[PDB]
From a paper:
Advancements in understanding the structural mechanisms responsible for immunopathogenesis of abacavir hypersensitivity syndrome, an autoimmune response following treatment with the HIV drug strongly associated with [name]*57:01, allows the abacavir T cell recognition system to serve as a model for assessing which peptide antigens are presented by [name]*57:01. The mechanism for abacavir hypersensitivity involves direct binding of the drug to the very strongly associated [name] molecule [name]*57:01. Solved structures of peptides bound to [name]*57:01 in the presence of abacavir illustrate that the drug forms peptide/[name]*57:01 interactions by direct H bonds and van der Waals contacts with both elements. Since the structures of peptides complexed to abacavir and [name]*57:01 assume conformations similar to peptides bound to other class I [name] molecules, abacavir reactive T cells presumably recognize a surface motif comprised of peptide and [name]*57:01.
Numbering used by the authors:
A (entry chain B): 1 to 99
B (entry chain C): 1 to 9
C (entry chain A): 2 to 274
Write the structure that this text describes.
């Protein structure tokens, strides 16, 4: 069976411009396990992004946390870009510091 | 600690 | 009031090498070990501070067990393929979860050993730790083989034995973190979306364990049909986050209260913007 990933983009700590932090993209609820996840800075792929070890939930769907160090500013935009076999084209979710 | 048990389905 | 769980995933990938095997271990909501067969040099590895003290015989032994289990699961993928008359050109997944729940006294509450094939239930050990539930005819084959080979008896001996005992050890070694609830830091934010409406978002941050309830009330009444609840999510520092939001008429914010239940909280919280 296959399931489409849920996506949340958010910071480890409350965002304060000029202060270092971590940008997270949490993908969950998906199946099968192959997935492509990029963090974007103003539309451009961030190179050194790490992720958690693959695990799964009670209903067998998978989840992963992708993350990297960032220092938020007023004008820099961030996003998470996800592709999965259940998706016709990559899905981009923008970072909203209020979410 | 993990289990050592090895079983074939 | 505690559990230890291991999560194994084996994934075939024709054209991309032998099947990949990944194992992770948790005590409660804390990951403490990992194994990935695709690592440059595959080993069981620590993922929580309190497991690092385990000696070389633990790490060497866990690494050997993981390498053996990977091989066994690769074989079981081949067997499942035959049960289901599927092509070798297709990719498939076995997922297996097992482990034990213990009570406050440190004794076994319930043992677990259940699995899925391509994300559907395959076979599960029942609570008696003596019988099986098979979800289809392929798993029914497995079920007969396992009764003949006393597999449930073997699992039961692990679950009643080493599982419970090592869980007890880990909980002692990591008592400062595993037996301490971290209450959420909470606050309400306000975001105008027009001249007539605004969003009230109730935040819970930095809590452990993951279990939590956030609810919005209007005039002391449940707004469940109208609340935007996000899935509890990892902060990345072993703590969790959640928020709940409601859209309210501008000016009527004081009609709304956010209610927070968490184990680290002496009393439930009532918040308002
Ligand atoms: N329910 C279940 N399904 C399995 N495989 C089916 C889905 C193809 C399976 N393989 C091994 N075990 C137990 C034996 C040792 C423990 C760790 O491996 C678990 C299993 N339990």
């Amino acid at each position: 069976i296959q399931r489409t990933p849920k996506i949340q983009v958010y910071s480890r700590h409350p965002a304060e411009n000029g202060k270092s932090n971590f940008l997270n993209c949490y993908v969950s609820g998906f199946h099968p396990s192959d997935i492509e996840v990029d963090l974007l800075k103003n539309g451009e792929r961030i190179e050194k992004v790490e992720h958690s070890d693959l695990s799964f939930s009670k209903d067998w769907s998978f989840y992963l946390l992708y993350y990297t160090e960032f220092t938020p500013t007023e004008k820099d935009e961030y996003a998470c870009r996800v592709n999965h076999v259940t998706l016709s084209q990559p899905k981009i979710v923008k970072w909203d510091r209020d979410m | 600690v993990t289990t050592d048990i090895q079983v074939k389905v | 009031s505690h559990s230890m769980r291991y999560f194994y995933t084996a994934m075939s990938r024709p054209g991309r090498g032998e099947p990949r095997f990944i194992a992770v271990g948790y005590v409660d909501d804390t990951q403490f070990v990992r194994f990935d067969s695709d690592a440059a040099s595959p080993r069981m590895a620590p993922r929580a501070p309190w497991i690092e003290q385990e000696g070389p015989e633990y790490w060497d032994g866990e690494t050997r067990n993981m390498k053996a289990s990977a091989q066994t699961y690769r074989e079981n993928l081949r067997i499942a393929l035959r049960y289901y008359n599927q092509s070798e050109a297709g990719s498939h997944i076995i997922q297996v979860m097992y482990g034990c729940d213990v009570g406050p006294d440190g004794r076994l509450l319930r043992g677990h050993d259940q699995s899925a094939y391509d994300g559907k239930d395959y076979i599960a050990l029942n609570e008696d730790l003596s019988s099986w539930t098979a979800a289809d005819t392929a798993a029914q084959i497995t079920q007969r083989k396992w009764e003949a080979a006393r597999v449930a008896e073997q699992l039961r001996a692990y679950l009643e034995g080493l599982c419970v005992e090592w869980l007890r050890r880990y909980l002692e070694n990591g008592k400062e973190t595993l037996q301490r609830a971290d209450p959420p830091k909470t606050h309400v934010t306000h975001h105008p979306i027009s001249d007539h409406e605004a969003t009230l978002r109730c935040w819970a941050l930095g809590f452990y364990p993951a279990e939590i309830t956030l609810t919005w009330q209007r005039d002391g009444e449940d707004q469940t049909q109208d609340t935007e609840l996000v899935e509890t999510r990892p902060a990345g520092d072993r703590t969790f986050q959640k928020w709940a939001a409601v859209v309210v008429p501008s000016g009527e914010e004081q009609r709304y209260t956010c209610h927070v239940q968490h184990e680290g909280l002496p009393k439930p919280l009532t918040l308002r913007w």
